[PDB]
């Protein structure tokens, strides 16, 4: 149907905007702390602590499969990156502090992304 196509075009355009958002958020992580999944070879107890691991590469795979239907879904995954790190790692660590800085800086980006998603529809 034409309606199905139009819905698919909207998903594609959302995917474009989310890719630009994802790029901008990941620039706020120049140490690449959140770039890849936590390794279960290197942190073998991780899944005892963190039930839904998340990282920028895993988000990028979901994105390229057009797997985010709305901005809320995408933000959920971004917040998991931050929140998982802030639980596993103590306050005095470079990991936790990197997470706080990513959260604070990414807030700005996400604030305008929400206005753009609403504005364009």
Swiss-Prot record:
Highly expressed in testis. It is found in: Nucleus; Chromosome. Disulfide bonds: none annotated. Residues 9-113 form the Bromo domain. There is a cross-link at residue 41 (Glycyl lysine isopeptide (Lys-Gly) (interchain with G-Cter in SUMO2)). It comes from the Eukaryota. Scaffold subunit of various histone acetyltransferase (HAT) complexes, such as the MOZ/MORF and HBO1 complexes, that acts as a regulator of hematopoiesis. Plays a key role in HBO1 complex by directing KAT7/HBO1 specificity towards histone H3 'Lys-14' acetylation (H3K14ac), thereby promoting erythroid differentiation. Component of some HBO1 complex composed of KAT7/HBO1, MEAF6, ING4 and BRD1/BRPF2. Component of the MOZ/MORF complex composed at least of ING5, KAT6A, KAT6B, MEAF6 and one of BRPF1, BRD1/BRPF2 and BRPF3. Interacts (via PHD-type zinc finger domain) with unmodified histone H3. Interacts (via PWWP domain) with dimethylated and trimethylated 'Lys-79' on histone H3. This is Bromodomain-containing protein 1. It comes from Homo sapiens. The lineage of its organism: Eukaryota, Metazoa, Chordata, Craniata, Vertebrata. The chain holds residues 555 to 674 of 1058 of the full protein.
């Amino acid at each position: 149907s034409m309606e199905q196509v139009a819905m698919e075009l909207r998903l594609t355009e959302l995917t474009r905007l989310l890719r630009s958002v994802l790029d901008q958020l990941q620039d706020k992580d120049p140490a690449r702390i959140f770039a890849q999944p936590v390794s279960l070879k290197e942190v073998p107890d991780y899944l005892d602590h963190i039930k839904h691991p998340m990282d920028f590469a895993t988000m990028r795979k979901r994105l390229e499969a057009q797997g985010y239907k709305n901005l809320h879904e995408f933000e959920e995954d971004f917040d998991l990156i931050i929140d998982n790190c802030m639980k596993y790692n103590a306050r005095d660590t470079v990991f936790y502090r990197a997470a706080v800085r990513l959260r604070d800086q990414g807030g700005v980006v996400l604030r305008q992304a929400r206005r753009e998603v609403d504005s364009i529809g």
